[PDB]
Structures are given as structure tokens and as C-alpha cells.
Design a protein around this nucleic acid. Structure first.
Ligand SMILES: C[S@@+](CC[C@H](N)C(=O)[O-])C[C@H]1O[C@@H](n2cnc3c(N)ncnc32)[C@H](O)[C@@H]1O
Ligand SMILES: C[S@@+](CC[C@H](N)C(=O)[O-])C[C@H]1O[C@@H](n2cnc3c(N)ncnc32)[C@H](O)[C@@H]1O
Lengths: 227, 363, 121, 363, 227, 121
RNA sequence: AGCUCUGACCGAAAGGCGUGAUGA
RNA sequence: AGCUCUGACCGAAAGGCGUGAUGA
């Protein structure tokens, strides 16, 4: 039954899958690969990797109608907390060959599970680092267009602002997913969310906040602009 | 001024301009590891001397240690992030790297990483468990081979036994100083040794109850000392190992209680799988054999001290209080174990903070 | 859709277990919670280990399934953990529980057994 | 042909003639110490080849070994005392050495004699006692850092634990072989290793239950090994010392029961003084209460009388008999000690002989 | 009281002491030197080193009327078993400046007590070595005129023959002192003395035996000459 | 003239001891021989330790003098050993003996005591 | 001669608490 | 818990033996 037609965002596709329903999905950059064991589907000449909102936040972000999305073919993005690559694998599809991604995990065991991928899919650069230290990678990255921060850690608000001065280029965006207990497990979700926004708006302009429900609970994705 | 590339170390003029550059002479993956870490190499020092050469006392770096140990080199430097240089290079890399500059940042990049990441293994939890015990053996061995070199060398110099009670120095005395008459102020200080220590002994050297040894008796004892000294060295490289494999085994446990106490807890476990697989109650009390006496010969009540009590927070905290604090660290440990076993995701700072703020209290 | 759940439970088959403890709390004991639940499992006091699909960090009980298979005990996921708390002794949440000596509900248990033993492959 | 001077090594024509010589390029005293004892040095092998240039397969020395290991390397030689060469030199030294030749033989000799002689010391009965216990320690120390290395490396290669049961070769394997996939027939025999051995294990490499290590897990463990194999080096130089100061302490006890056992006997004495100053009854049984410690305390073989029972003659002879032999060597030993304490005079061949023919017997 | 006039032997002297009696003595080779703590008396210009028979066997052998005595001014002697030096301290005096003694101790401790002396008295060469093995000193010596063997040791009979082949030169004499339980403790001294005489006569011409009583018990000097 | 003899002993004060033993062997013990002689000296059992000036090698008893000045015992050399043997229990030579419990000779002992304490310097 | 920490209840309240109190 | 070998008598003889037999 599957039908596949262009979604609003460049590098995103909508599918009317078996029954009636709608899911998003992205063109596989390297046909034949399968990263996180997700549903590929075949279309005219080509394979589109489904992207499940329950797996990637940024997927859930977009199914919840993320308004504006700086990550588009050709763009150079810095990715903090790239992990296995389940979440960043998809942006690779989007970004494309003249696109470039700088992935940064910290635990060496997880990032490992990525390193073999980057042979087939060569627009990614796994870099074992700590976001808390931007300079440790000072010589492995070039100024980026989008910064992307996942990394559930209390200081994550400042993490973004730091990297942002180091790397993010004037007037490019960056967007962060916040889990809220990452920051403070005691005080009320909106209040931390609201605090986080202020701490950001001190450096950026916070041009959006989007809560990630039903998929993920008590998270929210923000996107900010660098003046 | 001075920023590092995936190709060479560049020093830029105060405005925008080049000045000079040094290319990585070995494998760039290798050099960078040191430079990125804050470490200073020769490729760097070859540069700065050349920069002094053109008359620059002015110095700036992107890392805090590159500047702090640059001053430990002479030159007055300072730390500033995205400084004029890093900004220059990362701004438009193909200026310096040609058009294929990314394909480059890529190779040096995937290359540097495969270096720092340990190969897939499933035994490495039990490898740390040897290495942790294998350093407790090296600890029997050392107290023992010092016990020898202490009284044997005291035949020749009884005094200095309780003079330099700190072992690593007694040893290096015997190892370099050698014969009782080789000792002099100059080489006595080169050993550590306060301005009094260099006397409190030098007085004893000059008159002593000491027996007499010749180039042969000495030459053996000084050969026991060259072994103590390589055993110490064998210690450094054993913990150095632990603290690097914890990265690949329990990033969290390591980030929570420290790489050593992590590996220790992994030890009286049976490994990680067991450490992970069990309660927090079977954790707080682990190393519990010795708390202390009061019925061995006297009379009193029994209770217990498990390993994790060396947590500086459990330690500087008192009687009354405390073990309520053990109850806690035990739990965050059980969580650390599981994510560490199954995932590897660094969730540490989350529950590190969940713990800190935790169980503030009644006194 | 947590990744520590082996099989796919029906939302009632669970419920029968969710109340199977509710009144299994009487004339036999249970052991509320995940710390003393893991207790019983290692010592074999575990008849059936019932768990929750809610619990996060998802690694807090992610260890139970392997530990159970090893110790030869049946387990179940009751999709809500706040209900599992109150269905034991007390309101506040229970990530998982198990039963040692069912008591009231003695024969009322292995129902789930015969059903878990196949459904999980 | 060949004999040695106080200045050089001469090689003489079959009749009387000089052929060629090689002067001593080091301090002669140092080279002679090596040559006189039968050891071969460069100056001698520099010669041999230079002779074979001139075309000499014929070779004749003055010492059994100069000829033995002259075959162990190339050349065909035969041992003969006061051979044409040695005879030409001492016969008319003036020829070779000038008009002052004695003042020379004098220097090189007095010099060499102060080389082999230790300086005056009253502590050396104890310095030995240290050494002899000091390597009873190095023996504890080695067994233990072996049990570690054994099971630790047996994570990566379980099989070869009982494959190479002889400790030193297990070690050197790990130390050079290193990683599992490094082993091969060629470098496997480089270690000792029968041709069956190189098989019994080589299948065990190919198949295995062994977990995986990388360039890192190894490189620490192959750093344990490098240590065990220097402790060994320390043991050699520990016995190499006992068997030298035993010349300067008790030449007699040494020449009688052996340098080690002589040091052990001095050892559970409290020293040389306390040895010579006690009966022969307090001697024969000594390690009897150190070897009887094996029934009710720690436990072992049915308790073994005495230290001195390690005498090859006490051993190669039976129950019924034996016994009365200890009573004897016991006797000679007390004597050797007093002579040794007081005099040093080498009377040892006397009692050695008085003992040997002693207590021939019943059966 | 003391009067000192020449003895029959070149290099030996006689003294008529405090009261009535006769002792021997040598002209100290290096005035001021005192070896074994023996009585040195002074004479017209020089000193004479008393020589006590109870200490040096060849001292006794000379008070017992040793018939012929090959050790004379100029002669190069191989001294085997040279000890502290008490016993060859004297022959050094006789031998004199153009004379050369090669001493061989085995026990290194005793030899050491010689070594200081031979700085001053530079005609002796102390050599650590084992008479059993003559080659062990093969390159420290040159052919001698006399060999002298003390060394209470069983083979000693042999020891002498063995050295006499390497070192001692044609028609050169040698003299050994035998203790008789040195060789066989059990059997009768005048017996071993014989079996020893026979053992030597196989190689030498046994030109003398002289019992060392009363001074030393059951010893005897032998002189042999080399065909 | 052996050098292990400190003091110069009387040609008589000696046989008095050589004969102070002969009948000191009667209801008091002796401990004949040099081995069990050294035995007694280390255990205090020695009253007077008598030696010989003959004995050779002269290092076989050369140890008794030092061991005595230590254990605080008086000692005397009887110029012949063969004598000393017979004067103890048996003909064959005795290199030294000493007195435990003089027995016959109780006070006939310390006669040599006084002398020997003054003699030895 | 070899083994196991304990499992709802501190807080005046606020409500913190089986994702561990309090007792060890 | 922490520390002590036994002292004239084997050999047919020869005579070997406290400068240790024989028994341990
Ligand atoms: C997005 S989380 C894993 C994805 C998630 N399961 C979804 O939803 C990504 C990673 O952040 C990493 N991380 C935490 N702190 C970091 C830091 N300071 N620098 C880089 N990575 C970090 C963790 O190791 C973790 O693997
Ligand atoms: C002259 S004797 C002892 C002197 C004694 N004062 C008389 O009377 C000297 C030496 O002969 C030594 N000796 C025995 N065998 C020897 C050997 N094979 N080689 C060299 N010296 C030996 C002994 O060490 C002893 O010190």
C-alpha cells in the first residue's frame, strides 16, 4: 500500500503506510545500510528510512509540528551527544554529501558502535569528547551552521552557549532538547523549562519552545538564534 | 596568536595575518592527542622559539594548560578561547587546507578516535579486576622489598632508617647516593629534602655506628633499590591502566566514586554483571570484614564497615550522621552499575547531582 | 515502548496479575519495591516477578528479566506502575514487585505462568 | 701457539716464532680476570680470526676452556699446558716487555689482586645473611606476581596455563610473544619449546575459549612480565653475590657444603661468630624445627630433619643409614667455621677428605 | 748486649742477644717496616729483623741446620701459600732488590693482609690463586729459580711437581714443608714422609728431608732439585 | 706455644686441676669431651672449664676462651690432652673438659678460681 | 568453620517517601 | 605458645673411638 510524497521540510518525506496512517521518513544516504534497525521502505528507484518519533526526539519534535528546522541539505551542523547515531543517522540523510556533521559522544563504548557506520556514510566525524570542554575538540571542528545538543546533563544550558561562542557562526541557529530533571529533579517542569529559556535568551534569541509529548515525557525542544 | 589545526600548529598576527606555521611531523592523530589535552609538544616549542626569534614575548593559546605550562617554559602567555587564530582557521579552512579540507578533517578525525577507543571486548571487566588486585600484590611486594633494603642498608648506615621514613625517598637515596660517603649537600637536595633534612642526616654521615661496605656490597643493595624503583613505576602504569579502562567499562561508576574505588567495587562482585545485578543493600556493605573490635578480647557490640566509605563526603562527615549517607551512595551506585553494564550512556552527572543535593539533613 | 520488555502483554492479563497481588497481599507475603524484589529473586523466594512498563530511567529495573531467566522465574509487565504501588501495600509507586508465598491467590497465580512460558520466546 | 701476557695476547709459530700479538686495550687487570679463568674475550677472538686470515686452522691453548669454546665458535683447537707460547714468554720475558718487565708484571698483578679482594669489613657475615633472606623474599615476590600474570593473561589465553607449567617460559612468552595472534612456529621455538610443544599450544591458539585483548590490555600485562623477568635477574645477582662474599667470609664452609648452604647455615646462627662458637650438635639439626613446622602448624611432607641434609651425600643415601653422616658433616662444619672466623686459611680440603672417607660402614 | 755477624747463608745473620744465646735474623729490606710484629734490632747503620723459628717453619728449618738453601740474593722464587706474609717477609729480605717473589694465597682475607706491605717492599707480587690450578696464574708469573710450597693440603706432593713443570726452570731447586696429616691423618708420619719422598723422586732428585722438631710437631722440610 | 692460650699456666697449678678432675668424677658429674664441654658452657652448667695446650688443629677448641669470658666462667689449660682424657673417664685423649657439680672436690675447686681471675689480664 | 544490612515512616508544618524512612 | 639431639662403645679379627660410637 505504501505511498511516499514530499514533506514540507527539505529532506523529509511522508508515507501513507499500510493502513491509513502518516509517518515521516528520510532518504537513505547509503542504500543497503541499516543503522538502528528501523523500517526501510522502497520507492521509485530508492529507499527511504522511516524515522520513528519514539526513538529520536528530533523525530518526535517534527511530528509535533516543529515550526522551523535549520537542518537542511548542505548545512554543517555540530552535534553534541551523538551516541550510537540512531538520532544523528537521519540528519545525515537530510544534510547530504556537501553536508557535514561533527558528532561528539563522551562514553567511548557507545561512540564505538558509530565508528563503523561512518565508513559507508562519510559525512559524519565521530569525535570522542566532552561538550563541557569545547576546546578539547578545538582542532577537530570547523565553525558550524547549526549546533545540536542532546546530552542530558544539568549544565546543558551553558553547554550550548559555550559551544556556540566557539563554533556556531553568526546568525546560524542551534536547537536543544531538554529533559528538565537533567537540570533539576525537584522543581516543577515548566519552571525549569522557563528558567532554561531565560538563561539562553541572555546569549541567543529563543525563537521557539516545543514540548515533546506524548512521545517523550517532560522534555521540550527549543530552538534559538545566534544574533 | 596560536591555534592548532588537523594539519599544523598555526600562529597568527594580532590582526588577521599568518606569521608562520609548523606541520605535524609525526602522525597528526598522535600530536593532536597531546595538544588537544592541554599538553605541550616540540612541534609547538620549535614554533615559539622561532616566534621569539622574530621578537614576540606576546603569547596567547586556546587551552589553559598550553599557556600555564608555556610560562613553565619561560614565555608570558595567556589563555583565551575562540582566539583570533582558532577563529581564522575554523572560519575558512580551505584557505589553509585546499578544497578537499573536509575529507581531511575527516581522516585525521576518525583516525584520532579509533586510537582513543578500546577495541570491542567482553572480558575487560575481569581485566580491571586482575589489574586492581594485581596492584595489591605489587603492594605486598613493595613493603616487603623495602623491609629488606631498610635493615640491610642500615648495616652501613643505621641512622638514616628513621631519618627518611618516607619510603620512595629512602629508596632513591640508596639508588643514587650509593655509598655512605657519596652523599653531599648538592645531591642530598636533588632528592627532595628540606634544608634541615640535608643536615639531620649529613651530621650522621660524618660520624656513624655504621659498618663498612665496598664497591661490591653496595653495588648489590643499590641493585635492590633499582628494583623497588621499577616496582613503583609498575604501580603508576597499573592505575594508569585502571583509570583508562574504566572509561570502557563503567564510565559512570568511575565518574561517581572514582576509577580506583569503581574497579574495587567491581572486584568484590565477581565483575560488572554481578555488581549491576544486585541490590543497593548488597552494595553499601561490600568490603565488610573489618569495622573494628570490642569482642575479640574485651566485650562490646559488632557492626560493620563496607568499602564505599572512603567517599570523601562519607569520610569528612561524622558519627551520629554518616551511614545514612552510605545508604544513599549505595543506591546511585546500583543505578550506575546497570546503565554502565547495558548502555554506557553518561548519565553520571544527573545522579551525581541527585546524590549531592541528596540527604542534606538532621544532626 | 520500553526496550527492556521482552514480550507483548495484553492489558488485562496484566490486570489479573495487577489484582493478583492486590489480594495476594493477604495470608501470604509479597515484598514491595525493586530493591527487596531483586532480593527475593536471587534467593529464589520469587514465585512470579511482576514489573512496570513506565519506570524511568529505563535501566533501573532493566536488569530483572535477565536475572529472572537465570533463576528460572516467570515475570510480567503491568503497564502502569502507580497502580502496582497501590496494589501492593501503599500508594507511592512500585517499579516492580514479586510474590513470595501467594497465600490468598495460591492457585490464582500460575495462570500467568502457563501464559508467560510460551509468549516469551 | 697461544698464551697470554701481563700486557697482551701472543700467538707463536710452531717453531719459536712470533706470528702476531694483540695488546690489551682495556685495563689488563680487567681482561686477564676474564682470560685466566678460561673465559674468552674480544681481544682473543680479534686474534683468532686474524690468524685465520694468515691461514691457521691449527690452534693450541693453555687452558681447557679457551680451547673448548674456541670450538664452540669456529676454530679447531686443543688444550696443552706449558705450550710453546706460554713457554716462550715466561722463558725470556725481557724480550717482549723491555728491561723493566718485572715492575710491570708487579703492577698488573698487585692491581688485579686488589680487584678480586674486598676491602676490610666486619659486617660481611651479616651482609650475606641479608642477601640470603633478601632472595628468600624475592622468591615469595616472584611466585605471587606469577599467579597474577598466570590467570590474568589466561583471560586472553586460558589454555596455556597448564601448557607451559615451567614458570620462566610462561613469562618470556607473554614478554615477547605478547598478543595471542602474534605467536608462530618460528618465534615459538625461539623460547626453548620442544617441537611437540610448538604444536600442543599452536592448535590451542587457533582454537580457544580465550577472550579478546587489544594493543592496550596486553601492553600492561606484557608490562607485568617485563617485571617478573627483571626480578629473576635480581635473583641471579643475589646468588652471584653470596657466592662471592662467601670467599671472604667462610672460604671453608663455602668449599665444604656450598656457598648457599654455607650462607643459610651462617643464617640461622645469627652470624659467623655465633656459628663457630656453638657445638656440632647444635648444628646438624637446624632447619629441623623450620621443616618440622609442617605437621602441627602450616603443614607438609613428614617432617625433615635439619638444614644440612641437603648435602648430596646425605641425600643419595638411605634411612636405616644416613643419620650418622649428618653427625659427621655436622662435626666438620663446626670446625670449618672457627677456622673461618679466626683464620680463613683454606684447610677445607683436609676435613673434606677426612669426612669423605669417614663413616664408611654397616648397611 | 747484642752482637750481629754474618751467618753461613748469604743474606742470613746471627745475633748474640741480651744474655748468652743465638738467634737468626735478616736485614730488613725497607727500614721502618714491621710485618708480623717481630723484634727488630739495630746495627751499624741498618736494622736487622729477628727471625723466630716458632713462627716461620723455614725459620725453624734454618735453626735445625738446613743443609742447602737455594734462596739467595738475586734468585727469583715462586712462593706458594704465602699467607699474611710473616713467612715470606723474610725471604724477601734475603732475595733483595734484584730478587722477585711471586706469592700465592687462596683465602682472599689473609692475602689482603699482605697487600699493603708490598707497596713499600716491592719485590713481592701478591696473587690471589689456587695452587691446584697453576694456569689460573699462567700470565702473572715468569720462570723461577726456586719454588717454595707450604699450603697444608693433601695433594701438596703433587702440587709441587705440577708447578715445577710450568715455572721452575732446569736445575732449579724447590723446597716444600709437609705436615703429614695434611696428607694422611691416620697413617704413621715417617710412613707418609716416605711415600711422599717417593712421590717426588718420580720427578725431582730428593736432595734432603729435615724434621722440623722441636718447633713444629711432625712436619718436615724437603729439598728437591729439577733434572 | 699455641696462641689460643691467654694466660701462662703453672707447670703445677695445672695438674692440680688435671688431678682436681680425676677425683671430681666421683659423686659429681664431669661431661667428658669438647662437644658436651661447649654444651655445658652455653647453659651455665660449667663450673670450671679445663682445656689442653696440645690440641690441633688449634682451632678445634680455640673458641672456648671467648665463650667463657662471656658466660662468666673460669678456665685453665692442662699442658697435655692425653693426660686429661685418662683423668676424666677414659684413656683416649680429651681436648677439654669442664666441671659440672664438682662432687668430690667441692671446695677443692675454686683454688684455681682465685688464681685464674688474677692471672688473666 | 563458612554467612545476611533493615523495609514504611521521618516531618510542627510545608509533604518527602519503595525511582528507599529509620535502625544499623 | 615459641625451643632442646644423644655421650662410650661398634669391630670375628685387624683397633677405630670424645680431634665423636650408637641411638635418634
Ligand atoms: C541523546 S542521549 C541518548 C539518546 C536517547 N536515548 C534518545 O532519546 C546522548 C548521549 O549524551 C551523552 N553525553 C552526556 N554528556 C555528554 C557530554 N558532556 N559530552 C558529550 N556527550 C555527552 C551520553 O553519553 C549519551 O550517550
Ligand atoms: C704458611 S701457611 C700458614 C702459616 C702458619 N702460621 C705456619 O705455621 C699459608 C697458607 O696456605 C694456604 N693455601 C692452602 N691451599 C692453597 C692453595 N691451593 N693455593 C693457594 N694457597 C693455599 C692457606 O690458606 C694458608 O693460609
Amino acid at each position: 500500500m505504501v505511498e511516499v510524497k514530499k514533506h514540507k521540510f527539505p529532506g523529509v518525506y511522508v508515507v501513507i503506510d499500510d493502513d491509513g496512517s502518516e509517518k515521516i521518513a528520510t532518504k537513505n544516504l547509503v542504500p543497503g545500510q541499516r543503522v538502528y534497525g528501523e523500517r526501510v521502505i522502497k520507492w521509485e528507484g530508492e529507499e527511504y528510512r522511516i524515522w520513528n518519533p519514539h526513538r529520536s526526539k528530533l523525530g518526535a519534535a517534527i511530528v509535533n509540528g516543529l515550526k522551523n528546522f535549520p537542518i537542511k541539505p548542505g548545512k554543517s551542523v555540530l552535534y553534541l551527544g551523538i551516541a550510537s547515531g540512531t538520532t544523528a543517522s537521519h540528519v545525515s540523510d537530510i544534510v547530504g554529501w556537501e553536508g557535514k556533521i561533527y558528532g561528539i559522544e563522551f562514553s567511548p563504548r557507545v561512540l564505538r558502535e558509530l565508528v563503523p557506520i561512518v565508513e559507508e556514510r562519510r559525512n559524519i566525524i565521530p569525535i570522542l569528547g566532552d561538550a563541557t570542554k569545547p576546546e578539547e575538540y578545538r582542532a577537530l571542528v570547523t565553525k558550524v551552521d547549526v549546533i545540536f545538543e542532546d546530552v542530558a546533563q544539568p549544565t546543558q544550558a551553558k553547554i550550548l552557549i559555550d559551544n556556540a561562542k566557539a563554533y556556531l557562526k553568526r546568525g546560524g541557529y542551534g536547537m536543544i532538547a531538554v529533559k528538565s530533571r537533567s537540570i533539576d529533579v525537584t522543581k516543577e517542569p515548566e519552571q525549569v523549562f522557563k528558567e532554561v529559556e531565560r538563561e539562553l535568551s541572555e546569549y541567543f534569541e529563543v525563537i521557539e519552545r516545543l514540548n515533546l509529548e506524548p512521545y517523550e515525557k517532560d522534555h521540550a525542544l527549543f530552538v534559538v538564534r545566534k544574533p | 596568536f596560536i591555534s592548532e589545526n588537523v594539519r599544523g600548529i598555526y600562529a597568527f598576527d594580532e590582526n588577521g595575518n599568518l606569521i608562520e606555521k609548523r606541520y605535524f611531523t609525526d602522525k597528526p592523530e598522535k600530536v593532536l592527542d597531546q595538544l588537544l589535552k592541554g599538553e605541550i609538544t616540540k612541534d609547538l616549542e620549535e614554533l615559539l622559539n622561532s616566534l621569539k626569534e622574530k621578537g614576540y614575548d606576546e603569547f596567547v593559546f586556546e587551552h589553559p594548560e598550553l599557556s600555564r605550562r608555556a610560562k613553565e617554559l619561560g614565555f608570558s602567555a595567556t589563555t583565551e578561547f575562540p582566539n583570533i587564530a582558532g577563529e581564522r582557521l575554523r572560519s575558512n579552512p580551505e584557505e589553509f587546507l585546499g578544497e578537499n579540507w573536509f575529507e581531511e578533517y575527516y581522516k585525521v578525525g576518525v583516525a584520532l578516535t579509533r586510537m582513543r577507543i578500546q577495541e570491542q571486548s567482553g572480558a575487560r571487566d575481569k581485566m580491571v579486576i586482575q589489574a586492581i588486585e594485581a596492584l595489591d600484590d605489587v603492594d605486598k611486594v613493595i613493603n616487603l622489598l623495602v623491609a629488606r633494603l631498610r635493615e640491610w642498608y642500615s648495616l652501613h648506615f643505621p641512622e638514616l632508617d628513621e631519618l627518611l621514613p618516607k619510603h620512595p625517598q629512602y629508596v632513591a637515596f640508596v639508588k643514587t647516593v650509593g655509598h655512605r660517603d657519596n652523599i653531599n649537600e648538592e645531591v642530598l637536595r636533588e632528592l627532595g629534602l628540606s634544608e634541615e633534612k640535608i643536615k639531620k642526616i649529613l651530621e650522621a654521615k660524618e660520624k656513624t655506628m655504621g659498618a663498612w661496605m665496598d664497591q661490591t656490597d653496595i653495588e648489590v643493595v643499590r641493585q635492590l633499590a633499582e628494583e623497588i624503583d621499577r616496582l613503583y613505576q609498575l604501580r603508576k602504569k597499573l592505575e594508569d591502566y585502571i583509570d583508562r579502562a574504566m572509561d570502557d567499562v563503567a564510565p559512570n561508576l568511575k565518574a561517581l566514586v572514582g576509577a580506583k574505588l569503581a574497579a574495587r567495587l567491581i572486584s568484590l562482585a565477581g565483575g560488572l554483571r554481578e555488581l549491576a545485578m544486585m541490590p543497593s543493600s548488597t552494595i553499601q556493605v561490600l568490603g565488610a570484614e573489618k569495622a573494628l573490635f570490642r569482642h575479640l578480647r574485651t566485650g562490646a557490640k559488632p557492626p560493620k564497615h563496607g568499602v564505599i566509605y572512603q567517599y570523601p563526603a562519607i569520610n569528612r562527615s561524622p558519627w551520629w550522621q554518616r551511614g545514612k549517607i552510605a545508604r544513599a551512595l549505595a543506591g546511585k551506585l546500583a543505578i550506575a552499575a546497570r546503565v554502565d553494564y547495558f548502555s554506557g550512556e553518561y548519565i553520571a552527572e544527573e545522579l551525581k547531582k541527585e546524590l549531592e543535593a541528596r540527604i542534606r539533613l538532621v544532626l | 515502548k520500553p526496550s527492556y520488555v521482552k514480550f507483548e502483554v495484553p492489558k488485562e492479563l496484566a490486570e489479573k496479575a495487577l489484582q493478583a497481588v492486590e489480594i495476594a497481599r493477604d495470608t501470604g507475603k509479597i515484598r514491595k519495591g525493586t530493591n527487596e524484589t531483586t532480593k527475593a529473586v536471587e534467593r529464589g523466594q520469587a514465585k512470579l516477578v511482576i514489573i512496570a512498563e513506565d519506570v524511568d530511567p529505563e535501566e533501573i529495573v532493566a536488569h530483572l528479566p535477565p536475572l529472572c531467566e537465570e533463576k528460572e522465574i516467570p515475570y510480567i509487565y503491568v503497564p502502569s506502575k502507580k497502580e502496582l504501588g497501590a496494589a501492593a501495600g501503599i500508594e507511592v509507586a512500585a517499579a516492580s514487585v514479586a510474590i513470595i508465598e501467594p497465600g490468598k491467590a495460591r492457585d490464582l497465580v500460575e495462570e500467568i505462568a502457563m501464559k508467560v512460558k510460551e509468549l516469551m520466546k
